[PDB]
Amino acid sequence: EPTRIAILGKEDIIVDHGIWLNFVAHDLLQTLPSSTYVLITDTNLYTTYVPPFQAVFEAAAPRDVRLLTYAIPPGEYSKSRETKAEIEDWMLSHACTRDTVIIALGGGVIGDMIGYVAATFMRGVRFVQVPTTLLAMVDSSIGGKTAIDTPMGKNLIGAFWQPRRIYIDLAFLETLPVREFINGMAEVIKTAAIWNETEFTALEENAAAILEA
Amino acid sequence: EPTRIAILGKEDIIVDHGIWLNFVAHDLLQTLPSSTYVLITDTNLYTTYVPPFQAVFEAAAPRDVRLLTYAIPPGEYSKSRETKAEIEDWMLSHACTRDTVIIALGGGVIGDMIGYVAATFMRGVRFVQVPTTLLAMVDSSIGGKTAIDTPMGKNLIGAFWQPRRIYIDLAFLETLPVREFINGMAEVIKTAAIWNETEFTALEENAAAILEAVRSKASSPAARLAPIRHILKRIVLGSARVKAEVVSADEREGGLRNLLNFGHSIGHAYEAILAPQVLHGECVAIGMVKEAELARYLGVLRPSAVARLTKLIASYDLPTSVHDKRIAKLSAGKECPVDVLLQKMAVDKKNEGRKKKIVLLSAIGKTYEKKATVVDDRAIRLVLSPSVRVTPGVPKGLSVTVTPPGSKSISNRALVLAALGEGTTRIHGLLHSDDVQYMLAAIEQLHGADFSWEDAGEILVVTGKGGKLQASKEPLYLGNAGTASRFLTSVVALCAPSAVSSTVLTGNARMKVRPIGALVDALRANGVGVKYLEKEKSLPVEVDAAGGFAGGVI
Amino acid sequence: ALRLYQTGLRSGVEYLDLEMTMPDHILQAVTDAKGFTSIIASHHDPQCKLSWKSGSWIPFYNKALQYGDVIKLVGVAREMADNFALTNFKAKMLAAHDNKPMIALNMGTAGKLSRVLNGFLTPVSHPALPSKAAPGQLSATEIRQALSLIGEIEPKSFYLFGKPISASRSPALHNTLFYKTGLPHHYSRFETDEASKALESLIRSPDFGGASVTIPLKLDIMPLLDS
Amino acid sequence: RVLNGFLTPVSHPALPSKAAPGQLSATEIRQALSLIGEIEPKSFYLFGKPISASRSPALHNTLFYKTGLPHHYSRFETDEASKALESLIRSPDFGGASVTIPLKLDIMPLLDS
Ligand SMILES: NC(=O)c1ccc[n+]([C@@H]2O[C@H](COP(=O)([O-])OP(=O)(O)OC[C@H]3O[C@@H](n4cnc5c(N)ncnc54)[C@H](O)[C@@H]3O)[C@@H](O)[C@H]2O)c1
Ligand SMILES: NC(=O)c1ccc[n+]([C@@H]2O[C@H](COP(=O)([O-])OP(=O)(O)OC[C@H]3O[C@@H](n4cnc5c(N)ncnc54)[C@H](O)[C@@H]3O)[C@@H](O)[C@H]2O)c1
Ligand SMILES: O=C(O)C1=C[C@@H](O)[C@@H](O)[C@H](O)C1
Ligand SMILES: O=C(O)C1=C[C@@H](O)[C@@H](O)[C@H](O)C1
Ligand SMILES: O=C(O)C1=C[C@@H](O)[C@@H](O)[C@H](O)C1
Ligand SMILES: *[C@H]1C=C(C(=O)O)C[C@@H](O)[C@@H]1O
Ligand SMILES: *[C@H]1C=C(C(=O)O)C[C@@H](O)[C@@H]1O
Ligand SMILES: N[C@@H](CCC(=O)O)C(=O)O
Ligand SMILES: [Zn+2]
Ligand SMILES: [Zn+2]
């Protein structure tokens, strides 16, 4: 039951189960053709989820097409001016051109940082979102808000830059730690509190059962 | 006469004179209301132009509105990740919120950097452009391309972010240094070369007059520019309109906007190596010449056009080659290897993957495609390289018809004796040499013939006036055109006395130490007065306006 | 100034320091008649109007680049970080223009580290002189022992080869001069009648700084050496 | 190691090894800090008379050298606790001072505590 969701006039959000290692690679190659695909995640995620995607992707991709991979350190500190430059300088090492398609694999830290890199690299290139945290599935990956932190505060420098695709593979929640789950429930509670008292009431009843599981 | 120009569906460009210290402050406050205005320029501009704007602005602004000011260091090195952070951290010190309106006062370095800050500050805020260099008035301030440099190359990180207003106050050109003027003429030449052969032709004629005025030491900086005030207005309006239209059609450079990177594919590669000591327009000039030569090698551009483009660039005192003595002097003999240039071209933003895309001129005023064309690495390497590897082999049973360039001996004569005759001659295969170009203009000013071109400059239509020439009051500059000075010395003896009894031929520093003694001896002997004005037996020479030689024995 | 500058050039001085603040007509005249004198193009920023990070030095660098054989830029350090930024700046300039070396310093006691790390033609003081040319400049010896404490001058083993060398004064000699000059090296005995395979372990070691050779090895050593 | 400041681990020549390779001794770091501006030199004084044959300068200057500090100790003969003395004592260069005959008692009013 793969359900899609419309945003800004197109059904570019897709919510399914186990799409990372089949559908996503094929959809990128068919709907967002390019010479160069850049898959960026963090150190916690890389060796678990990147190598199997590379296998699938490089088997499907045609002769003159390439997949570049890179991991940044995990956590808020990577939404920074430095990490931005680190990624960009690396991309330019491999002569990534304007046709490059970036794949943000991770939570909101990856989503925001890599999205902002995408927004500004050669004055903008295509990118997609592959949220892996609850928070990113229900909030960060949607909306196209990308930013970095400065010493002054949160998300003070950034860009509105919409991803061409948002691939929500609920299966990523399987390896997500308990703390990061609870973290994302804040954004879920928030959304219900401003918009839907019935969903709110469901969240009340489901709380005991969710934490237990 | 404040003329506005439409861009992206609104007349947000305004071109006038002396608007910085009146109109701009009021227009900001009325059309872009905010709690906070941030005016950013560079150290060279600040104390001259900011304090008087603050006075005007803070007098007009209401009680709860503020103007913040900041200067960054001048020059390319400020289009950087650091300078970006420096500005942003400063803005956030003063709790600049999202309603902030940024004012970019300066040239393209300010325009690009401050625009990119505007594009990303709180995910975007309003900003305006106040260009102060020729380049920025005719190119940088329009189009909304903002960027920074990285160690890898030019403008590799940035954003498309359109200014709400572009205030073009031509008066800023008064304090602009001579070098920065010439720098911006590269972008002016470029725009004409891709879009308008008539403006191109005007730039040719205006070159001598523009440089003279810009280098003048006249009683004020404004009176300095007054003689070419109409020319500058034509250049700025004209050049701004082309860009505005191109940008409207193709804001995000999907195709047509490629054309504005003429000379920039190769130009930005040199600039990555030679900046900040070598300026942008200087690099564009060098690149334009190589991208023209490339097109010529590919059989897309006629050689005459390449010569014509190179001569124009050089006539504005821009470099035509990376080996220019001024580039060595400024760069401390910095080398630009081909492998490094190609490495810089591989991250040119027009490129479709590994395929490099370059704007190819088809003629002066036309482009081969209405976008950048894919060029093979081998051809780009050949143009940038100093040496040639020749692969042996020519097709079996080949037969070709090749026309080399015209002989300058027969071509220089052809112009002279066509101009002196009665009737109208079309000259095919004429070598457009420096001798021809200067003799042509010489005879024009003597009212000796009417000249005209056909087939994009390959045919010279000459209607001569049968030898009825008029002595020019103004001297005739020839450069170091030998054959020209020799032919014109006897030709200008034919002209009847009109304004003055005599007419003078001058030229380059090299011309002034070049012999013409024997020919002057012949004219004096055959009843034609002629006095040397500086050195004996060489130019400049004032030669009498007789009705021809005396005749008889010579 | 012009006449003084020419007195320098006429006297055949190996280096001459002209400030970039001097008017262009004098910069031209001194540059044209420089001959085989090396020009140090200098600028000092005692009032601290410039900055290493921000790149407000570039205009002076660009000028000094075309006038000088050696660029000399001197600023002020308020905090230790200001020396890091200088070092980073210098490195970026040398990468871009290998062919014109640089003397880059921060004045004040805060900027003492910039003198240590400068490396090339660092101006120094000496205790025997009545003043210091600039406040808080270090002596060649002090800088050299500062460099040693950070391992920028890595210690080295020096040896005396031969026998009998029990009563040799070479160790006293060279160790004293090492201490006196600020170097961290050390000189020691190594008695041996032959140029052994064990000797050439020391001689080809990366710790090897040099060695004296006496009886009976003055002749037998040569085959082990390259040149 | 020089710039760390707080609880820098150090070596000592009398120990058989170094705990980590290339660690410096407290003295070495302290004289490294002195060569850069980080330990600013200070003036130390001996007040009183007669102090021509006093060993205090030998004592304290030796310990300064031995510990790696850049400070310096010197004579200042005086029979009274003068206004010129308290210029030195209240100077920002002042590191400390020994006081002997006849100023052991007359000095106290010039001191805060
Ligand atoms: N743009 C927006 O609209 C928006 C919305 C909400 C939050 N945000 C931003 O997002 C950030 C928070 O994002 P986050 O909570 O996803 O943090 P995050 O991206 O750092 O991920 C949380 C941690 O869990 C790990 N992780 C992620 N997926 C995993 C998986 N499948 N299995 C195991 N471990 C996994 C990561 O390595 C990380 O250590 C904040 O900076 C916030 O400002 C942005
Ligand atoms: N955005 C675009 O599409 C676009 C187009 C062309 C060029 N550019 C960029 O623009 C930059 C070049 O800009 P630039 O040529 O204006 O250089 P610039 O902005 O550094 O200005 C040139 C110099 O002249 C000074 N100056 C400017 N106006 C002056 C005045 N009225 N009087 C006296 N001095 C004055 C400046 O302080 C500076 O030292 C390059 O980095 C190039 O990439 C961008
Ligand atoms: O008469 C001519 O056209 C010329 C004759 C030769 O001297 C040539 O060398 C010269 O360049 C032109
Ligand atoms: O014993 C010594 O110290 C030396 C004696 C001479 O042979 C010297 O030549 C040698 O270099 C050192
Ligand atoms: O002569 C001296 O150096 C001294 C004598 C005693 O008074 C001591 O108490 C004093 O500290 C030093
Ligand atoms: C240059 C720099 C000096 C310094 O600041 O240490 C000393 C001065 O005499 C030299 O000219
Ligand atoms: C901690 C750090 C040391 C060092 O690396 O200098 C020495 C070690 O013994 C301390 O535990
Ligand atoms: N002249 C512009 C070309 C880009 C554009 O305006 O489209 C530049 O130098 O960047
Ligand atoms: Zn949130
Ligand atoms: Zn340009």
- C-alpha to C-alpha distance for B303 and B326, rounded to whole angstroms: 26
Question: How many angstroms separate the CA of residue C40 from the nearest CA in chain B?
Answer: 15
Provide DSSP, B127-177: EEEEE-SHHIIIIITSS-EEEEEETTEEEEEEEE---SEEEEEGGGGGT--
B184 and B110, same structural domain?
no
Helix axes B81-93, B108-120, angle to 10 degrees: 60
| Angle, helix B377-384 to helix B338-345, in steps of 10 degrees | 140
DSSP β-bridge partners for residue B538: B515
In D, which residues are within 8 Å of C138 by CB distance? 35
- Could you say which DSSP state residue B458 is in? T
Same domain, B197 and B101: no
Residue type, C84: F
CA-CA distance, C224 to C203, in Å (whole number)?
A: 9
- Which residue, chain included where needed, has tokens 């013409």? B516
- Contact (Cβ atoms closer than 8 angstroms) between residue C34 and residue C16: yes
Q: Closest by alpha carbon to B193, among B290, B244, B259, B256?
A: B259
> Distance (Å, rounded) from C-alpha A39 to C-alpha A54?
9
- Nearest residue on chain B to C57, judged by CA atoms? B73
User: Is the shortest distance between the CB of C188 and ligand 4 below 6 Å?
Assistant: no
- Partner residue facing B120 (CB), from A96, A98, A158: A158
Q: Determine phi and psi for C219, rounding to 5 degrees.
A: -95, -45
User: The domain containing residue C8 runs over which residues?
Assistant: 1-155
**Residues pairing with A157 in the sheet:** A148, B121
Phi, psi of B72 (to 5 degrees): -110, 165
Instruction: Please tell me the distance between residue D35's alpha carbon and the centre of ligand 7 in angstroms.
Output: 24
- Contacts (Cβ under 8 Å, ≥6 apart) of B170: B15, B16, B17, B137, B232, B233, B236
What is the rounded distance in angstroms from the CA atom of residue B310 to the CA atom of residue B320? 6
**Residue D99, beta-bridge partner list:** D47
Buried b (16+ CB within 10 A) or exposed e, C76-98: bbeebebbbbbbebbeebbebbe
**Residues B422 and B546 both lie in one domain:** yes
How is residue B250 annotated by DSSP?
A: -
Which of B77, B239, B31 has the alpha carbon at shortest distance from B143?
B239
Element (H, E) at A6: strand A3-7
Residues contacting A53, CB < 8 A, separation 6+: A20, A21, A24, A25, A39, A105
Tokens of B114: 């401050």
Return the C-alpha torsion angle A107, A113, A115, A121, nearest 10: -150
Ligand 6: residue whose CA is nearest its atom 1: C123
Tell how far the Cα of A180 is from the centroid of ligand 1, in angstroms.
8
**What is the SS3 assignment for A75?**
coil
A109, A131 Cβ separation under 8 angstroms? no
Q: Is D11 on the interface with C (CB under 8 A)?
A: no
Residue B349 zone, left/alpha/beta (φ > 0; ψ -120 to 50; rest): alpha
Strand B361-363 versus strand D72-77 pairing type = unpaired
Say if residue B276 is preceded by a cis peptide, omega within 30 of 0.
yes
**Exposure string over B267-305, b if 16+ CB within 10 A, otherwise e:** bbbbbbbbbbbbbbbbbbbbbbbbbbbbbbebebbbebb
Backbone angles phi, psi at A159, to 5 degrees: -165, 145
Token output for A184: 């994302």
The DSSP bridge partners found for residue C76 are: C107
What does the alpha-carbon distance between residue B490 and residue B528 come to, in Å, rounded to a whole number? Answer: 9
- Distance, CA of C140 to CA of C115 (rounded, Å): 10
CB A88 within 8 A of CB A121: yes
Q: Name the resolution in angstroms.
A: 3.0
Give the sheet arrangement for strand B502-506, strand by strand: B476-477, B502-506, B541-544, B530-532
Which two structure tokens, joined as six digits, stand for D53? 């044959």
Report helix angle A108-120 to A81-93, nearest 10.
Answer: 60
Which atom of ligand 3 is found nearest the CA of B412?
3
* Count helices and strands in chain D by DSSP H and E runs: 3, 3
Between CA C212 and CA C199 the distance in angstroms is 13
Confirm if B271 and B183 have CB atoms less than 8 A apart: no
Which residues, in sequence order, are bridge partners of residue A40? A70, A104
Assigned token pair, B278: 């070598």
Determine how many CB atoms are found less than 10 A away from the CB of residue B482.
18
Tokens 């304004």 appear where?
A: B499
CA pair distance B238, B261, nearest whole angstrom: 18
CA-nearest residue of chain B to A153? B92
Distance of alpha carbon B443 from alpha carbon B469, whole angstroms: 8
**Which ligand minimizes its atom distance to the CA of B112?**
2
- Chain B residue with CA closest to C68: the answer is B332
Let me know if chains B and C touch, i.e. at least 3 Cβ pairs under 8 angstroms: yes
Residue type, C161: F
Pair B171, B190 in one domain: no
- CB C16, CB C40: distance < 8 Å: yes
Integer Cα distance of C136 and D70 in angstroms: 14
| Protein residues with CB under 6 Å of any ligand 7 atom | D 9, 19-20, 23
B102 φ/ψ angles, rounded to the nearest 5 degrees: -90, 140
Q: Which residue has the tokens 């452009």?
A: B129
* Contact between C97 and B332 using a beta-carbon 8 Å cutoff: yes
Residues of B identified as active-site: 253, 268
Question: CB contact, 8 Å: B80 with chain A?
Answer: no
DSSP secondary-structure letter at A140? I
Peptide bond into D50 cis (omega under 30): yes
Measured between alpha carbons, how far is A204 from A199 in angstroms, rounded to an integer? 9
Q: How many other C-beta atoms are found inside a 10 Å radius of the C-beta of residue C207?
A: 12
C-alpha D31: how far from chain center: 13
CA dist C71 and B411 (Å) reads: 53
The catalytic site residues of C sit at 44, 72
Question: What is the layout of strands, in order, in the sheet containing B10-16?
Answer: B3-7, B10-16, B165-169, B126-131, B101-106, B36-42, B66-72
Rounded distance between C-alpha atoms, residue B438 and residue B535, angstroms: 22
How far lies B442's CA from each of B111, B434, B437, B487, C20, in Å? Answer: 43, 12, 9, 11, 46
CB C102 within 8 A of CB C73: yes
Residue D37 contacts C, CB cutoff 8 Å = yes
Cα distance between residue C115 and residue D40, in whole Å: 17
- Token representation of residue B406: 């015209």
Q: Which ligand is nearest to the CA of C107?
A: 6
Rg (Cα) of chain B, in Å, rounded? 27
D41 CA from centroid of ligand 5 (Å) = 23
Q: How far apart are CA B460 and CA B458, in angstroms?
A: 7
Lookup: tokens for A165:
């695709």
Cβ burial of A176 (10 Å; 0-12, 13-18, 19+) is middle
CA distances (Å), B433 to each of B411, B507, B511, in order? 9, 16, 16
Q: Provide CB contacts within 8 A for A122, sequence distance 6+.
A: A97, A98, B156, B157, B158, B349
Q: Where are the alpha helices (DSSP H) in C44-156?
A: 58-67, 81-96, 112-118, 140-150
* Pairs of residues, one from chain C and one from chain D, whose beta carbons lie less than 8 Å apart: 32
- Whether the bond between D70 and the residue before it is cis, its omega within 30 degrees of 0, is no
Domain extent, residue B324, equals: 177-385
Backbone φ and ψ of B262, nearest 5°: -70, 130
Exposed, middle or buried: residue B481 (CB in 10 Å: 0-12, 13-18, 19+)?
A: buried
Q: Report cis status (omega within 30 of 0) of the bond before D102.
A: yes
Q: Under a CB-based contact definition with an 8 Å cutoff, are residues B13 and B166 in contact?
A: yes
- Exposed, middle or buried: residue B422 (CB in 10 Å: 0-12, 13-18, 19+)? exposed
Omega prior to D92 cis, within 30 of 0 = no
Contact B528, B542 (CB under 8 A): no
Considering the domain architecture, whether residues B325 and B458 belong to the same structural domain is answered as no
Instruction: Name the β-bridge partners of A130.
Output: A105
